[PDB]
Design a protein around this ligand. Structure first.
Ligand SMILES: C[C@H]1CC[C@@](O)(CNc2ncnc3[nH]ccc23)CC1
Ligand SMILES: [Cl-]
Length: 167
């Protein structure tokens, strides 16, 4: 039993809710919140820009130190950093950004990072400003993640279409 509330159950291990991931994070304070990161951990917009704003830019400060030490992530890769005031940890995961021409096949590799964590709050990877079809992203999520994932979809209109079209 966990403290995630109001989710629709999609499969044995995947749950979905129309919600702002920022507001969800502050309520549950989960062990792991997933960020829709880029390889540079530049959290300017989308989910990343919103999460970073909620940390008063502390996420960006920590991220810049991480990159200065380690260099960029791989597309499809991830790193674990602090969750600041939102969660214990933030798993920064890089899905492909279609608006950069990046290979959508790497979306499965991106979701594989979730399997290293028993429970996660997460957005749909490569959705929103990353330009991929959120319906496809949901399919890859369900077919790749085996741990317990609670998916927050900000767009109420998008949430309804994802539910109604789910196979
Ligand atoms: C274009 C849509 C793509 C899918 C989204 O779910 C991604 N953005 C977010 N998702 C969840 N909490 C959030 N809080 C702030 C942003 C945000 C909603 C927008
Ligand atoms: Cl977005």
């Amino acid at each position: 039993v966990n403290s995630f509330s109001g989710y629709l159950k999609l499969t044995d291990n995947v749950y979905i809710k129309n919600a702002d991931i920022v507001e969800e994070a502050k309520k549950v304070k989960p062990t792991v919140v997933v960020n829709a990161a880029n390889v540079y951990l530049k959290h300017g917009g989308g989910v990343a820009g919103a999460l970073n704003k909620a940390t008063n830019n502390a996420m960006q400060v920590e991220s810049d130190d991480y990159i200065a030490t380690n260099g960029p992530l791989k597309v499809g890769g991830s790193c674990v950093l602090s969750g600041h005031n939102l969660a214990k940890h933030c798993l920064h995961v890089v899905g492909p950004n279609v608006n950069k021409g990046e290979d959508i096949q790497l979306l499965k590799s991106a979701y594989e990072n979730f399997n290293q964590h028993e429970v996660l709050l997460a957005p749909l990877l490569s959705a929103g400003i990353f330009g991929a079809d959120p319906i496809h992203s949901l399919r890859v999520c369900v077919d790749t993640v085996r741990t317990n994932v609670y998916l927050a979809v900000f767009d109420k209109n998008l949430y309804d279409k994802l539910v109604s079209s789910f196979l």
